Design a protein around this ligand. Structure first.
Ligand SMILES: [Mg+2]
Ligand SMILES: [Mg+2]
Ligand SMILES: [Mg+2]
Ligand SMILES: [Mg+2]
Ligand SMILES: [Mg+2]
Ligand SMILES: [Mg+2]
Ligand SMILES: [Mg+2]
Ligand SMILES: [Mg+2]
Lengths: 208, 61, 169, 294, 157
RNA sequence: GCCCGGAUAGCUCAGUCGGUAGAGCAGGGGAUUCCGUAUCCCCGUGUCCUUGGUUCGAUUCCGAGUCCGGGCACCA
RNA sequence: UUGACUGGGGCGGUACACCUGUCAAACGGUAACGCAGGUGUCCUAAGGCGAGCUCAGGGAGGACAGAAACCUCCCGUGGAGCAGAAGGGCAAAAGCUCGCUUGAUCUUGAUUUUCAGUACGAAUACAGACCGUGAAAGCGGGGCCUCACGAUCCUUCUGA
RNA sequence: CUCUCGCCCACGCAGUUUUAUCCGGUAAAGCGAAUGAUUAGAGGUCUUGGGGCCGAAACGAUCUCAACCUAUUCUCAAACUUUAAAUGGGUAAGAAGCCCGGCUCGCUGGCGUGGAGCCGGGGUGGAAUGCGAGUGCCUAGUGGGCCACUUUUGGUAAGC
RNA sequence: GUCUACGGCCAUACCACCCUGAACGCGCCCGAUCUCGUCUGAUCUCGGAAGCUAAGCAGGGUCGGGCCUGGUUAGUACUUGGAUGGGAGACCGCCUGGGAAUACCGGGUGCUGUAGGCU
């Protein structure tokens, strides 16, 4: 396995696993949520993201070592089943290897140069989140230190951002309890199901 | 002994060196490609208008 | 209260499915003609599966449809060998039903060893005055929700006439 | 719980056409029967729309424009009591008498009556009209049954020969007139001159006198109503073919007679249905609050 | 190299657009094309019988020849260093009337007649069109209120 | 240090028809005979290499990882 | 006498004639021993016309009968099929079944595609015969379209 | 060589803009829109696959994983797409134009219909800017290219 | 105020459910002796006119689903041209001109042509 300096900056147009590729190994990440996945919405109010500063590729194998580094740290102080780590970007870009000398000039030169699949990486944009954990509001300083230890396993630059939302939802945490209270939001597990005021009136009778 | 395959480099500036020209649409295009049954009538109409018309034409003109 | 909207016999369809063609399928048509008085038509396969002994386009079954006054008169033969009882899950969601029999000589036919014994599948479709529009050529329409007939509305019909038994086990 | 059924099928659904969803036309045959060979540039292609219904047959001559069809003349069969055929307005002999009304009325409009009189005596044989030198040419026209199954003896071809015998040039074959033996090749014109005067529905009256006069009262009841008897019937069409060939002009009733306007609902407005919503939202919470606190 | 086939790069452009598939509208055929009608070419994908090529789709020509089901159109084609008056037979489903001269045909009709209105009334209407001129010295009004002070917002992610 | 087929009972091996894990050597228990040899029969023993996918069905098909052996080998 | 291309040549391969998607940077054009594939066929119907019908699938029922036989009803925008490689197209259809047929014939030019704006090949719009089908409008001079092929010289057969 | 400007309007043309009018599927965006991938929980229950008991036994009775469905949610696509730019491509911006009168036709054909053609008559100032054009013959050299913005393919990269 | 026949544009016209339908019409309907076609007068074809608006059809309704249209999203994402701009690079900001897409929010829901009849 070549160093990640070789497989970094987004150069080729994205080449996913499909019926055209057919020769790609498995990504070392296969699980993506590792805290207490079963939690409800009000059980972990705040969240904290780590956000890319530059447009690069993070390998599937680097995302393994990062989420292990954060799940190990947060059972130490926040405890087992007191958090919900989610690794958000999924590796779909297949990198290639021109596996030469398969010490000789004997195979080819640069003659048949289109290579074989060798791994999977995730193309990340400027401002796109990589990992995201959510905890109690009492455990806020452990959010940063868990993401601080995780960013030493990524190339490039990342900034850690404490969000303005309520958990892994899309609604702001200042008025979330103000607005899940009356009718507009219903909790379904670890997410929130927004209900408009434009459906059939029968489900509004099913509500209340 | 490998060489260069195909470019269009330099070719656009030597096309406009003599300045690409419209085909010079000239009044009375020819009757090539016109379908024959329409065309075989239209010269029947031409070979009789000069013959049997111009005594009953000038007086109304 | 509900005039000219009533359940009548629309058509009754019968078949025998033999696993093969040849001699055994030929006199099964002889059975099914003497039930009805009309010629059977030959169904055939389109899935060679090679474990039923079946082959594509091999004449696998015979069937017919019976309509009108002859439909109720062959149905009453099938309902007395079945003894005018059914199950609740003999009734489809579209309302139409069927029961099937074994030993076709329990229906009005005498026995012949050179013919053999077949089992029928009586299946009765139900209808009203007005179902013709979904099969009409020119202005094809659908039937409307209040005019289509349901599972419960057919089992109250099979009880009313024929004093039948639903047997809800 | 069972399946995945549709739910985004409406997102991608592509309706056929308003006239195809109604079920009237096909547009496969209309594409081939309506549009001109466009080196003729303006000249209309004329159709002969023959539509049977329950209780009526509709004969029309139309041509198509871009904004909709133009209909040159129409002739019906609920008109036909004014000429003598007062009952049985869907048999083969009404269809022959409706197309002949349709053929004479068109030629009356264009001024072509004294020329192109067609076939005065009705023999059922294959007549075919030509174009006499010096006069205006024959009105050429093309039949379409529309969406009907054209077997032999289809009554759309009764309206095809009424048009022929009035002087309309229509390309056709005698293979579909009733009186054509299928396993033979001959066309019995004697049967087709019998089928055209309604004697086979007259023989079916005679078959119901001498066998069972009870069924003769259930069917054919309104023949008995005014006066219709199977010996009167063969002259009754021949007295109607005489009358339509001398007066096809279709005078019209002057239509006025009334001025009233209310029969169905108007579409309710935004403020009427938006206030219908909260009137239900109030009525719900009055039976949630009061009828559960009591 | 590149497979010089007829109908080669038309994975999208010889297709019906979206939810306009099926059989064609019939007023496509009840169009009247005379000689010298300016028409433009947009080849459909349902009728296979007379689609032109992928070089004329989106171009505009002029009718020189009319037959039963098709129309001869004389177009210009950019080949390398010269353009060529080329003449193609195209069936009638693949073309339409170019509306590019139809906004010229109004301002020759209502320009010839407005010319002879100045001969009966006596003026110098100046019927030639001008481009958009620079704006006139107008006069704005802040009646009642006073203008709104806006300022750039701070940066927050 | 690149490729071709294989990963299975104590071993070893075939087949794992898209529907059972079955020959055989080693041990166990019988039967046999005057007693043993050989024999003959029965009982034991299968994550059918690990995970994922393809039908009331996959160890069996498809391809990912790991392993084991077996190999393409120029003039300079 | 001992082919060429070729990240030296050899070995290998065909990028040597042709087709589809992409590359290709929203007209067209555009390279590499770039990517994923295909071609040297097959068909008297799988050609031509007309008619009738609806597909894959799923549900609920029905003797054996079960995930898979056949029968019936319902839903079903193409999720199937159209010989095959792909893409485009197609629903009283270009699919499925049936009924007649040979237009897969005879002949002159024009045009498009490759292009030098040459040729072959393929294609298009006609025109003139003679036909087929259909009630008719019409459609048809091979295959729903994009591929499926070959000069001079010589041989051979046919024609007045 | 054919001509045009020499002294209230240029014949004409344009690597340009404007005025309209078409064309297109890339950037982006989308997948709670189709195709293809893909993570997580929630709710519901026809069930089988498997467990927990009341128990000779009873789809008599009571839970769990799954599967199925429903509403959501995380992440994508050179060979996916409803939507869809900027740059771009075509045409048009008058006298070869417009209107009227008549007549030839063997084409078309209810029709002094339709369409072509011919003759005659009437009214020229018809976006901005720049500029003299049109046309033929004869013809050499060339047919190894290289670099840089920006856009992109193979490659770990390269003064590849 | 609607309908029928034939159409044009082809969802603002569809889909699901629910109410209403005077009068003419369209239909359901009632029958196989001929025309014709079937395993089966169901379809198709043919003769009717005792019933019925039950269905289709037509109008309307649904904090309806789609569809159409406009806001937000957003001068955002992208982009033409420019710089001896920044940065180790990856990329970024500015100048000059253009300029979207979804979530989310709202408003709509067939328009008409020729011929004919009811009212
Ligand atoms: Mg009969
Ligand atoms: Mg018969
Ligand atoms: Mg009947
Ligand atoms: Mg009704
Ligand atoms: Mg009603
Ligand atoms: Mg409505
Ligand atoms: Mg809605
Ligand atoms: Mg720029």
């Amino acid at each position: 396995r070549r160093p990640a300096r070789c497989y970094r900056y987004c150069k080729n147009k994205p080449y996913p696993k499909s019926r055209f590729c057919r020769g790609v190994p498995d990504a070392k990440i296969r699980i993506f949520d590792l805290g207490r996945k079963k939690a409800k919405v009000d059980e972990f109010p705040l969240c904290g993201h780590m956000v890319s500063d530059e447009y690069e590729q993070l390998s599937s194998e680097a995302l393994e070592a990062a989420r292990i580094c954060a799940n190990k740290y947060m059972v130490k102080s926040c405890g087992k089943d007191g958090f919900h780590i989610r690794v958000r970007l999924h590796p779909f870009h297949v990198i290639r290897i021109n596996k030469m000398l398969s010490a000789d000039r004997l195979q080819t030169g640069m003659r048949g140069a289109f290579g074989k699949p060798q791994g999977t990486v995730a193309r990340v944009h400027i401002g796109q989140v990589i990992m995201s954990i959510r905890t109690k509001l009492q455990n806020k300083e452990h959010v940063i230190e868990a993401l601080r230890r995780a960013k030493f396993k990524f190339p490039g630059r990342q900034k850690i951002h404490i969000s303005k939302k309520w958990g892994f939802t899309k609604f702001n945490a200042d008025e979330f309890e103000d607005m899940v209270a009356e009718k507009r939001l219903i909790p379904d597990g670890c997410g929130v199901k927004y209900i408009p005021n434009r459906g059939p009136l029968d489900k509004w009778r099913a509500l209340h | 002994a490998k060489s260069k395959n195909h470019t269009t480099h330099n070719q656009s500036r030597k096309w406009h060196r003599n300045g690409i020209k419209k085909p010079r649409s000239q009044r009375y295009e020819s009757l090539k490609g016109v379908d024959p049954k329409f065309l075989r009538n239209m010269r029947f109409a031409k070979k009789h208008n000069k013959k049997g018309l111009k005594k009953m034409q000038a007086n109304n003109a | 209260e509900n005039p000219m909207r009533e359940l009548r016999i629309r058509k009754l369809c019968l078949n025998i499915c033999v696993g093969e063609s040849g001699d055994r399928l030929t006199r099964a048509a002889k059975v099914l003609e003497q039930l009805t008085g009309q010629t059977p038509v030959f169904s055939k396969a389109r899935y060679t599966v090679r474990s039923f002994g079946i082959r594509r386009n091999e004449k696998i079954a015979v069937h017919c449809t019976v309509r009108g006054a002859k439909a109720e008169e062959i149905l009453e033969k099938g309902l007395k060998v079945r003894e005018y009882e059914l199950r609740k899950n003999n009734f489809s969601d579209t309302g139409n039903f069927g029961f099937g029999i074994q030993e076709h000589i329990d229906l009005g036919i005498k026995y012949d060893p050179s013919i053999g014994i077949y089992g029928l599948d009586f299946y009765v479709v139900l209808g009203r005055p007005g179902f013709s529009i979904a099969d009409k050529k020119r202005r094809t329409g659908c039937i409307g929700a209040k005019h289509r007939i349901s599972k419960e509305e057919a089992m109250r019909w099979f009880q009313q006439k024929y004093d039948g038994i639903i047997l809800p086990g | 719980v069972k399946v995945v059924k549709n739910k985004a099928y409406f997102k991608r659904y592509q309706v056929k056409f308003r006239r195809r969803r109604e079920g009237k036309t096909d547009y496969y045959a209309r594409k081939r029967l309506v549009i001109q060979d466009k080196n003729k540039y303006n000249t209309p292609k004329y159709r002969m729309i023959v539509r049977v219904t329950n209780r009526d047959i509709i004969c029309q001559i139309a041509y198509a424009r871009i904004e909709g069809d133009m209909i040159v003349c129409a002739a019906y069969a609920h008109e036909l009591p004014k000429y003598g055929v007062k009952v049985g307005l869907t048999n083969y002999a009404a269809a022959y008498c409706t197309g002949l009304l349709l053929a004479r009325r068109l030629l009356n409009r264009f001024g072509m009556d004294k020329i192109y009189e067609g076939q005065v005596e009705v023999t059922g044989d294959e007549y075919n009209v030509e174009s006499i030198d010096g006069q205006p040419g024959a009105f050429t026209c093309y039949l379409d049954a529309g969406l009907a199954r054209t077997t032999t003896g289809n009554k759309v071809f009764g309206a095809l020969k009424g048009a022929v015998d009035g002087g309309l040039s229509i390309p056709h074959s005698t293979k579909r007139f009733p009186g054509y033996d299928s396993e033979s090749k001959e066309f019995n014109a004697e049967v087709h001159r019998k089928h055209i005067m309604g004697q086979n529905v007259a023989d079916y009256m005679r078959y119901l006198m001498e066998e069972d006069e009870d069924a003769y009262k259930k069917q054919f009841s309104q023949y008995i109503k005014n006066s219709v008897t199977p010996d009167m019937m063969e002259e009754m069409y021949k007295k109607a073919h005489a009358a339509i060939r001398e007066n096809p002009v279709y005078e019209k009733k002057p239509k006025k007679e009334v001025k009233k306007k209310r029969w169905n609902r108007p579409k309710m407005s935004l403020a009427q249905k938006k206030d219908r919503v909260a009137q239900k939202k109030a009525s719900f919470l009055r039976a949630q609050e009061r009828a559960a606190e009591s | 190299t590149n497979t010089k086939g007829k109908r080669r790069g038309t994975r999208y452009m010889f297709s019906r657009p979206f939810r306009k598939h099926g059989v064609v509208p019939l007023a496509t055929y009840m169009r009247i094309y005379k000689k010298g009608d300016i028409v433009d070419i947009k080849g459909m994908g349902t009728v296979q019988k007379g689609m032109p090529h992928k070089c004329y789709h989106g171009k505009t020509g002029r009718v020189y020849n009319v037959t039963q089901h098709a129309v001869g159109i004389v177009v210009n084609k950019q080949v390398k260093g010269k353009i060529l008056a080329k003449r193609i037979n195209v069936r009638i489903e693949h073309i339409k009337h170019s509306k590019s001269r139809d906004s010229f045909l109004k301002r020759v009709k209502e320009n010839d007649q407005k010319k002879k209105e100045a001969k009966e009334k006596g003026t110098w209407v100046q019927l030639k069109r001008q481009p958009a001129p620079p704006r006139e010295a107008h006069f704005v009004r802040t009646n009642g209120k006073e203008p709104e002070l806006l300022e750039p917002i701070p940066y927050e992610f």
